[PDB]
Amino acid sequence: GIKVFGHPASIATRRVLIALHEKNLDFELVHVELKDGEHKKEPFLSRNPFGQVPAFEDGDLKLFESRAITQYIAHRYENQGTNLLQTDSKNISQYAIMAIGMQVEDHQFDPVASKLAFEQIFKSIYGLTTDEAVVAEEEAKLAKVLDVYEARLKEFKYLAGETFTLTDLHHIPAIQYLLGTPTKKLFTERPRVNEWVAEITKRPASEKVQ
Template identity: 25%
Template sequence: MSGTLYTFPNSFRSNKILVAAEYSGHKVTVDPAFVVGETDKSEAFLKKFPFGKVPAYESGDIRLFETNAIAYYVGNAQTRGADKEAEVLQWISFADNVVQPAACTWVYPTMGIMQFNKQNTEKAKSDLKAALTTLNTYLSTRTFLVGERVTQADITLACTFCMLYEHVMEPAFRDAYGNVNRWFVTLVNQPEFKSVLGEVKLCSKMAQFDKKKFDEIHGKAGGKKGGEDKKGKGQQTGAGDSKPKPKSEPKAEEQPAQTKPKKDPWAGLPETTFDMDAFKREYSNDKSTGHLQSIKYFWEHFDKEKYSLWTSTYKFPEEFALGFMAGNLVEGMHQRIEGTRKHCMAWQQIYGRDKKPKYRLTGLWFWRGQDLLFLRNESWQVDYESFDWRKLDPGSDEAKKMVEFYFNGPETDGEYEIKDTKVFK
């Protein structure tokens, strides 16, 4: 078995795939010619992978674009968990939906990728402490997460924890979680892990927000003089540093904009007549019943050629034991996509009922462009894979009903009662 993986170097998502392949013996070749922002935007690539997502995998007629699906495919009975696949999937979900969002919220600002927000960072630390405490107890009688051998559960969670251990989980923080530390160190020192990750060095001091690096990465998106030269220089530091200790430097996945950090995510889109700021003011000031005034304004001014309408549905509603958990997830997501606010607006509604699943999270979004806006910037992609996305035809009756439904924020959708509406504007 063999195939080609399209990705950029040191992607923590791709590492999950490559480590699985090491265990199964599946030969995976990383395309050396891949350039993020170019290869994945090319006609040839989009013909194979219409969503333009990476990592992407090709083997004969098989073409896959979701990390977990690719890892499953290149794995074997051991990594899949044999007769315990549900338990493996449980921990993969835990890594993707509990650990990863909190890890990115905490680590990315220290690398200049995201703006620092004290409240969100403290909440991320709190969420991680809760997750680590539970995991530490669970591992007190276990070597691995599922069964007696390494599975994709261990691979996915360990690769997700790498950025934490390498950048922010200093000894004073991690010492309380001895069982987790033992589990992590055991894994990253396995030959299959080391062949992909190299030598993983645990940080000795917690990294802090790097405002200078943040300004360098984000301050030139508007085209400051000399930005291109400095952008190239920025790429030579960090993950591409020539120092002999690359694993102590930030990885490319942890600096997702590193290949072309200064590029404006909205560059190349045609001009539009739709004034997003004007619409947001209209919506915010609309006191009419059912938001009829802003609905009318929306359809009179909406540029359906330059903007697109989408619905979102959270894939894992069973995770919401309490309603506030859904609210916290949405607030964290909105903070992480702050950079989209100029060209995006969304309504995310949390509904509840008595029987299981007790809650569900759905939404209506519109943004500039016809593709998924999350694909325009790697740092916006923390949460979007946890949702099912569906593009609406703006001329359809369904689109009109959806706009009316979400603008109004009805008390019920017929089965669930509304608990909260989070508007991103």
């Protein structure tokens, strides 16, 4: 009984939909009206007391926080679909590599790419103008992150190894949005990042969420 509680335009929720499709799982996307302030009132507060989407439910097991859910799915449904984990589970070196990688995207990438997608895709919805100063400022930090990935991808085929992992997946939602923004120049101006981005986004599980 898989029920994802969220908003289909949310980057955090899309992150959970892709992982679900990646494991050919069946679920029901229970929509939460963020505009009606639903998430900030019972009974959603019993699903996520911090009042945010997504919230998840695998039968009786309840979770929230998108990366905690992806990891749950990754293990709980390991012997099914694509392996979103390291190839050799006994390799501590591959474990440490993915740990850093999942810590990096969450602290260094996500915060920047979100502010950038907001200023350039959600503000424009309500006819607001993008703060050009902020945009350029956050773009400076993202190029820094991408220069590090450019290094990683010259050795590895993916961010945490020669295999597609949750590390790469966590970026997908944010990258899809930035792609339809002039910010896409940062991904294209780097050879490895460009190729890598065109790989992870042209995946059918990825194409099923846009």
